[PDB]
Design a protein around this ligand. Structure first.
Ligand SMILES: *[C@@H]1O[C@H](CO)[C@@H](O[C@@H]2O[C@H](CO)[C@@H](O)[C@H](O[C@@H]3O[C@H](CO)[C@@H](O)[C@H](O)[C@@H]3O)[C@H]2NC(C)=O)[C@H](O)[C@H]1NC(C)=O
Ligand SMILES: *[C@@H]1O[C@H](CO)[C@@H](O[C@@H]2O[C@H](CO)[C@@H](O)[C@H](O[C@@H]3O[C@H](CO)[C@@H](O)[C@H](O)[C@@H]3O)[C@H]2NC(C)=O)[C@H](O)[C@H]1NC(C)=O
Ligand SMILES: *[C@@H]1O[C@H](CO)[C@@H](O[C@@H]2O[C@H](CO)[C@@H](O)[C@H](O)[C@H]2NC(C)=O)[C@H](O)[C@H]1NC(C)=O
Ligand SMILES: *[C@@H]1O[C@H](CO)[C@@H](O[C@@H]2O[C@H](CO)[C@@H](O)[C@H](O)[C@H]2NC(C)=O)[C@H](O)[C@H]1NC(C)=O
Ligand SMILES: *[C@@H]1O[C@H](CO)[C@@H](O)[C@H](O)[C@H]1NC(C)=O
Ligand SMILES: *[C@@H]1O[C@H](CO)[C@@H](O)[C@H](O)[C@H]1NC(C)=O
Ligand SMILES: *[C@H]1O[C@H](CO)[C@H](O)[C@H](O)[C@H]1NC(C)=O
Ligand SMILES: *[C@H]1O[C@H](CO)[C@H](O)[C@H](O)[C@H]1NC(C)=O
Ligand SMILES: [Ca+2]
Ligand SMILES: [Ca+2]
Ligand SMILES: [Ca+2]
Ligand SMILES: [Ca+2]
Ligand SMILES: [Ca+2]
Ligand SMILES: [Ca+2]
Ligand SMILES: [Ca+2]
Ligand SMILES: [Ca+2]
Ligand SMILES: [Ca+2]
Ligand SMILES: [Ca+2]
Ligand SMILES: [Ca+2]
Ligand SMILES: [Ca+2]
Lengths: 493, 156, 493, 156
């Protein structure tokens, strides 16, 4: 904070950083400015004058050697035709703007994209969520818990379960105001696990809406350490650690196809980016690595494999250049790399062994595994860590439940041509059919495996402002509306 | 060959002409999007290929990085190891391959019974509709050796 | 269930168990009844007749040998003057009556003591709690949770704490309707733990009454694995595992005195029985044992030391002959012994490593440690186990929060004569003074250590049927009464 | 000796006569409750000593167990080991005794600083009002070697 301090007079060269050095020291071939900004240009000669219009900007006549010119603030020496200066593209700096950056001549704007109202805040400006405050999804081995970040209160949700694992959700597929979350069940004793799905209300209701669990039928499954839902392609990607493979199936569990089965030691949590048509996953075996590939499964490549411990949680910052973040529970650090793998930088260290991470707004969320705590920090590595809540050591993940985290206006490129599955890929799509089947000879669309009807989900309980759900003789849900509200679902009153 | 209104990709699969230059790689060889003129902008302005936004003739050839790619200044202005035949259970233990889903938990945690639907039974074993592997002598005998009873169903 | 089945005629001797054996087999010196009940008396002779009135009851004339007499049902051969039978004292049988037993001639009554209404139940009769349904106190390392057994719902209680351990409570000391619980804090890093106490409402209020924690000032304390509160003597007994001692102090933490400091490897949870003036504690070190002593500390003795694994939780059945139960987390069994140490019998096995136990009504409660579950079973070893709830692995104890568990009408024998402490003992009391001090010479009451004033507890929040507590300018609590209720504490409306 | 209204126990501590036969062991030798006639019951009935409940003359001498004690039929009818001088920390580690609460955490977890209020400082060390042990040369010097500043307080 400085209006103006320690001004430099005519005798003192102002430099580019306020280095108040005497004029005789300018262009003496010795750097006093600390960045050679006092040796700028260094085109010298006594018979020359500044009036000739040699330099583009800040042309001053030195006492000796003629004219010596510098750059306007926000500009740098061009290293060619040194009497000229070009604009610094400040948008390339990491963490200079919260959401978006536009370049100007020595200036920039921290605009933020649609769906984000600019909100001046403390120690910098951010952009709000333009909707209901985000929720947190906390899976314990027996139950799933919700947490309103702004209201700061829990709510009864899925209970009476066993061995819960990673969580992912699909925002309101039927637009009836109910999103669906997907949770995996570990295999205990001699019984296989499963991938189950259930509804969750986007509104404030809870503790009175009996959630009914339904299995997808994906039998012969042991340890789904990682799961991700492609909302564009309507496919669910999960990685079985014991089966040493990462595979794909439709949202209702049909047409199971193995996607990647080679060179996988222990596939950890995965992620998908339908906008770029790129899937990401982590391996935490004897050779830790972070790999990305197309949703089809082609062009598999390794992003980072150096200075990696136990990469066990990975998430993508969709709204910031599709940047990729991951959590290392062994090195105790959280790092970020661009989706192509360049510009690696650690974001936060001494993270106390983060297990899972999820990015929302200008802040990063991660779980201290052994401490059972959820921690919050600026997602660009600045500031200091903040604690959120303390929960059981059974906690396995933190996941933000909001719609802006998954851009819902990403159109699916599929033209309905595909018979069974239509996987995504950069700039387009592709056809595929279940495992143990092949295309009809001569065609790359039809496959010989017989089609299967989509699975029907039972009706959900929907009492928004209050009331209790109830099962009638045919078990359709019905709400007993509270005071001051009416309707089939107690909406208006 | 196909109709006049269907554009043909290199592999022989031909697609409707409306899908050409539609922004999506419709066919596998992605030739349906190559050889298409990029979107143009009015005179006095240029559009950055990586951004799709028009910028004026002043912003290009300004000796600095105006477009995101910045090519304008030079493109416009110019655990013991198991054997090969040993089946690996979940607990890293190695077991003989004869235990592969004989409908009885051998590896523990029913690892041997895992997903033997895609894999095929060996010639010495009979494959029934559940995918479980049973000896060929245990088919068409009046007793359901397979728990799905497909052994007694695939009989004359 | 039998009105009468397989009746025995005159020729068939009915026996004491329905052994329909022929009359010629009676008193043939070979047991056909299975208990020699067919050889009863065996006073034989043909010239003798039953009319002589030789036997007291059931005198019958055998076809040969004269008269042969048996015992009335509910009576046994006396083994002396065999023609006579005495009454079986059925009250000595374990688990024959739920709460109390009175003996009669071949009969008994399962009466239950004051404060227990007889309630016929399924598979046997029990006696109710004559009050609000019992609560459960579940200490997690960060928070304490409550659970209404009948309402089956949680309630917000003490939170924002660290390293909680064993729990004990004192029922409504001031009779203002607020009981006080005592919780110990483990020592973390290089900071000592403490013994803190706080209020808890006996009524249904919760989630809106800010509970204020206060430390007792018992500094220099590391690991209080066990704690018990003597409601009669107004003293608190705790056992420090690291300090290898079990000591006593008054309820407000004054006049600390070491009680037992010798031959203690790892003192586990303890218990006190003011009615008998006997303290009980368990050692889970290299030599497991269950020891009892007077509250004074004299007459220390070992109750059981054989077939013991890790005795880590102990509780006393006050209402049933002051019987003692304990939980063994290594042998995986829960056993019961009389307070003098005879009649040892395992109650339930395959208990899945119980950690703490607490007895209430006709049922026994224990915590499956690694499973984090609370389990319920008949306290007399019959029936089959029942599960209650599933909670975090941070669970450390289950404790029933009810007044009938601690008989409040046990008068303190102390005559206020004692200067600092008045410990209890069988049939009376005793005098003592803090550690590092001794009695004034010639007297066994006064001690030289200067007295200290009792500690003042801050006022609590009291809003029964509803409302929110609030702190005024002098921080006195005040409730904002809900609709349809009025009063300073919203009692009547 | 004491007043006529005070009953004397064997140790010399004499107690008021009202406390005699009051049901509580008032004095240590408990002689204030011995030599007192047990509570009696009306004729034709007997009171079990262990129960305090009267039962009739018919119930006694009935050749069975009427009272809880049942005496009526025969009483009425008739990790390396540390040295001796080594201080034990909480972590079983043995340390020299010079570390006992020198106000600096030596054993870890401040085990050496535990409860040195009842124990007395050794002659070579000065004891201040917090109970912490400091060398005798660190008393009355103008600086608070004890954190409670009692070293500079107990001075002439
Ligand atoms: C979620 O993804 C959608 C695309 O599926 C994004 O919508 C696009 O956002 C850009 C931002 O500037 C708009 O220009 C797009 O509008 C259209 O753009 C095309 C050129 O590509 C023009 O020819 C059209 O005339 C029009 O201006 C817009 N496209 C659509 C289909 O809405 C959206 O920004 C993104 N949202 C988030 C929060 O990431
Ligand atoms: C909690 O302890 C109290 C004693 O502190 C128990 O109260 C006593 O219970 C017995 C049960 O039958 C009663 O007789 C007692 O009444 C009195 O008993 C004496 C003889 O000891 C007589 O002389 C008196 O006339 C009177 O009948 C009763 N004593 C008191 C002081 O109430 C109580 O049962 C017990 N409660 C529970 C639930 O354990
Ligand atoms: C999470 O908490 C916020 C408040 O911090 C809730 O937002 C308000 O919800 C009420 C519900 O009736 C609305 O009437 C208000 O208009 C909302 N205020 C704002 C700031 O939008 C939000 O609904 C809560 N969400 C859940 C699911 O609990
Ligand atoms: C525990 O639950 C029981 C109900 O199962 C509660 O008992 C009732 O409480 C209400 C409170 O207004 C009383 O009006 C009823 O008369 C009670 N019924 C019975 C059977 O007594 C009990 O209050 C609950 N206790 C707590 C602390 O939650
Ligand atoms: C020269 O630099 C000054 C700041 O020192 C600035 O105000 C002025 O606009 C500049 N002029 C030119 C021509 O660069
Ligand atoms: C003899 O036994 C019968 C039951 O078999 C019983 O009903 C009867 O009262 C008994 N009589 C005597 C005198 O014991
Ligand atoms: C079917 O395929 C499996 C997996 O490759 C085995 O090779 C098996 O032997 C095959 N069965 C036959 C009959 O060839
Ligand atoms: C005080 O007592 C402790 C503990 O017994 C030590 O013996 C110490 O040496 C004593 N101090 C003195 C001065 O004798
Ligand atoms: Ca210089
Ligand atoms: Ca700029
Ligand atoms: Ca196309
Ligand atoms: Ca340019
Ligand atoms: Ca098998
Ligand atoms: Ca067969
Ligand atoms: Ca016989
Ligand atoms: Ca009887
Ligand atoms: Ca007395
Ligand atoms: Ca008798
Ligand atoms: Ca020390
Ligand atoms: Ca000093």
């Amino acid at each position: 904070r400085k209006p103006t301090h320690k001004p430099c007079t005519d005798t003192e060269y102002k430099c580019s950083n306020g280095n108040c050095i005497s004029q005789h020291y300018v262009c003496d071939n010795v750097n006093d400015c600390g960045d050679l900004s006092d040796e700028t240009g260094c085109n010298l000669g006594d018979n020359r004058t500044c009036a000739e219009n040699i330099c583009e900007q800040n042309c001053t006549q030195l006492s000796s050697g003629g004219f010596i010119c510098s750059c306007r603030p926000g500009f740098k020496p061009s290293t060619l035709d040194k009497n000229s200066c070009q604009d610094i593209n400040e948008c390339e700096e990491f963490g200079i703007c919260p959401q978006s950056c536009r370049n100007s001549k020595g200036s920039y704007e921290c605009f933020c994209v649609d769906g984000f109202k600019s909100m001046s805040t403390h120690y910098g400006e951010r952009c709000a969520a333009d909707g209901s405050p985000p929720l947190l999804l906390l899976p314990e081995n027996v139950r799933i818990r919700k947490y309103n970040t702004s209201s700061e209160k829990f709510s009864e949700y899925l209970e009476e379960e066993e061995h819960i694992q990673t969580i992912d959700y699909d925002w309101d597929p039927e637009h009836i105001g109910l999103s669906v979350v997907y949770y995996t069940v570990l295999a205990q004793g001699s019984q296989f696990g499963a991938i189950k799905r259930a509804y969750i209300p986007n509104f404030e209701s809870g503790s009175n809406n009996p959630i009914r669990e339904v299995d997808l039928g994906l039998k012969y499954l042991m340890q789904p350490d990682g799961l991700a839902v492609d909302w564009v392609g309507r496919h669910i990607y999960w990685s079985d650690a014991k089966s040493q493979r990462i595979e794909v199936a439709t949202l209702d569990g049909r047409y199971r196809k193995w996607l990647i089965t080679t060179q996988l030691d222990q596939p950890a949590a995965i992620a998908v980016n339908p906008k770029l048509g790129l899937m990401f996953w982590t391996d935490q075996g004897k050779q830790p690595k972070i790999e990305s590939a197309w949703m089809n499964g082609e062009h598999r490549s390794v992003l980072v494999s150096e200075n990696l411990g136990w990469p066990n949680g990975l998430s993508i910052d969709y709204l910031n250049d599709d940047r990729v973040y991951w959590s290392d529970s062994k090195e105790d650090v959280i790092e970020a790399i661009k989706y192509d793998g360049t510009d690696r930088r650690l974001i936060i260290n001494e993270a106390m062994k983060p297990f899972s991470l999820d990015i929302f707004e200008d802040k990063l969320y991660w779980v201290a595994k052994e401490k059972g705590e959820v921690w919050r920090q600026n997602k660009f590595g600045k500031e200091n860590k903040e604690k959120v809540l303390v929960v059981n050591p059974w906690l396995t993940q933190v996941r933000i439940f909001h719609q802006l985290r998954y851009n819902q206006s990403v159109s699916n490129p599929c033209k309905q041509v595909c018979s069974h599955l239509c996987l995504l890929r950069p700039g387009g799509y592709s056809c595929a059919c279940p495992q143990g089947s092949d295309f009809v000879t001569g065609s790359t669309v039809q496959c010989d495996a017989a089609s299967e009807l989509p699975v029907t989900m039972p009706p959900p309980c929907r009492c928004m402002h209050g009331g209790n759900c109830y099962f009638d003789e045919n078990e359709l849900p019905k709400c007993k509306c509270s005071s001051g509200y009416s309707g089939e679902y107690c909406e208006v009153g």
